[PDB]
Write a protein that binds this ligand. Sequence first.
Ligand SMILES: *c1nc(-c2cccnc2)nc2ccccc12
Ligand SMILES: *c1nc(-c2cccnc2)nc2ccccc12
Ligand SMILES: [Cl-]
Ligand code: NA
Ligand code: NA
Ligand code: NA
Lengths: 301, 306
Amino acid sequence: SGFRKMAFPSGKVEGCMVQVTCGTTTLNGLWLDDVVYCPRHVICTSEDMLNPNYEDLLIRKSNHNFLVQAGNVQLRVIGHSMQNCVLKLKVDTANPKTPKYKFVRIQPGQTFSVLACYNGSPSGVYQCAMRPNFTIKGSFLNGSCGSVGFNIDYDCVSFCYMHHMELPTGVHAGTDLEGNFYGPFVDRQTAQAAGTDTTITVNVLAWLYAAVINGDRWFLNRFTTTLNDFNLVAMKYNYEPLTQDHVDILGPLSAQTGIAVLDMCASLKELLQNGMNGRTILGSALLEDEFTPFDVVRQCS
Amino acid sequence: SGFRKMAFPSGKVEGCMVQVTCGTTTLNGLWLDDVVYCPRHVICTSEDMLNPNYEDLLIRKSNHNFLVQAGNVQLRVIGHSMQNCVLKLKVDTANPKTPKYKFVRIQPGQTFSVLACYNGSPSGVYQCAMRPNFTIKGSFLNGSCGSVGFNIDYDCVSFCYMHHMELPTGVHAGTDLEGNFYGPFVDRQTAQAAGTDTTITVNVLAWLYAAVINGDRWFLNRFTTTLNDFNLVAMKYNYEPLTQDHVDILGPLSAQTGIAVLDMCASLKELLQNGMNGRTILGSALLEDEFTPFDVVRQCSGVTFQ
Ligand SMILES: *c1nc(-c2cccnc2)nc2ccccc12
Ligand SMILES: *c1nc(-c2cccnc2)nc2ccccc12
Ligand SMILES: [Cl-]
Ligand code: NA
Ligand code: NA
Ligand code: NA
């Protein structure tokens, strides 16, 4: 028992992290088979910050303008192309530590592990969620761009995020591994701002089920609600709407605990109305929204 | 920007985890050079665990009674001995992925990363503090015993914890890698309970510094205090004493942020006396105590572990 924010073991990803340099710009890349993936803004100068023409910048580069260092060794770059906002560098060695992998684009609410890296070397691993406004709340310093986010549900690594930049509010934006941004952001230094963030309701419900599984009952009540009445209240506290999809996904936890999803919804309504009155749930005095239903089942069972 | 509960990258430890079986007992071991370390209770069944005589159980055992699997390969056990509450199994092959490592014993308040494993297979990584009552608040299911905790200092892995068991309250107990328990526990199935726990003061102060570095400043105030006055209040709230050594260790953060340690103590005094008045710090409504001063400096400065 116990319930903790837990990341995936990072070793399969560590064995893929390299350093990429172009001019005076250094950042991280991801070496899989014979391709290194990194943010395309590695080719920008100080001149280029607001309105880079990446196609124009890239045509001006040769293979030998890219320095790729893997541990103590330089890899030879033999090709380059751009896909959306990611640069792909073909190298003359396949990474012998390449794991089974795939690229997946995720939806808001989904969780993943981040391996924060600097100069191609791993610093630490933590757990994140894609927020409803398509940002993540990470921990990232200068040079961290090109660090990735991932899941590993079996022995296959699913890469879902590559870090590009920090917005003025201190939250983080990036792409999938096909180079498409999450949310309305662009890899330019023009003014951009995320939407007001909201709480991931289905994840809060999952976490309340985790609490029950771990022996906590104090917040339960004898009421139920309609889905529509729940959403009308929840929205007043900046909670995301709960859809019928989300109700269905919570079905297994409901069956395991004997508490109907809409019964649990009424417990959540009460918590929003009353606060915790000096109590905690699983060690927290706030409701936690960065555990998915899948995460709860994996960690509890 | 940003501040998260962060574990060390686990790859160097992952390459050391194996499965150990003795009879119908399976758990995890740590393979370093030509020795596999695991809990001694691998030699026990249920009834054995009521009142085990480990010496007597072990003397009866053949090398071939211990099955060690590393991935899909069996290792041959050629010897066995016990040290305190850990079993050491000599094997005929050195682990080629053995990292640079040491065994260390940590103190209450220190943090480490746990690599949770099942059947010799790493499943999760999280950060824990050794509580003042010598428990850890982990997340561990059946089969998790033998999972290890560690830090990385430069390129050296410091192993500090091996997981043995869960107490009735759902918190966790284990040993150092020389098999000595943290805390007043024994490896038998009997009623055992940890002492009342306390809050790790020096770590709460560290986390308040992290908050300030990240722009969260509302709890700062114009006041300072004395170590003695602060320690009287801490005692009242079941906080550990702050020593002069703790003050010294926070010195760098004080210099960097312009808030002296006893100035920060006066902030903490007020928070304990008055609460947070609806506000949060780094997204928390409780004071967090599982970040050390070293952890805060590392994460706010980007130290790496190639
Ligand atoms: C890449 N990423 C960052 C960065 C800084 C803060 C938060 N997220 C990302 N900064 C830089 C600076 C220079 C070159 C690359 C790069
Ligand atoms: C080892 N450890 C545990 C255990 C279960 C919950 C929390 N911590 C440790 N349980 C088992 C069960 C069977 C064999 C080994 C083992
Ligand atoms: Cl004063
Ligand atoms: Na690397
Ligand atoms: Na209810
Ligand atoms: Na003050």
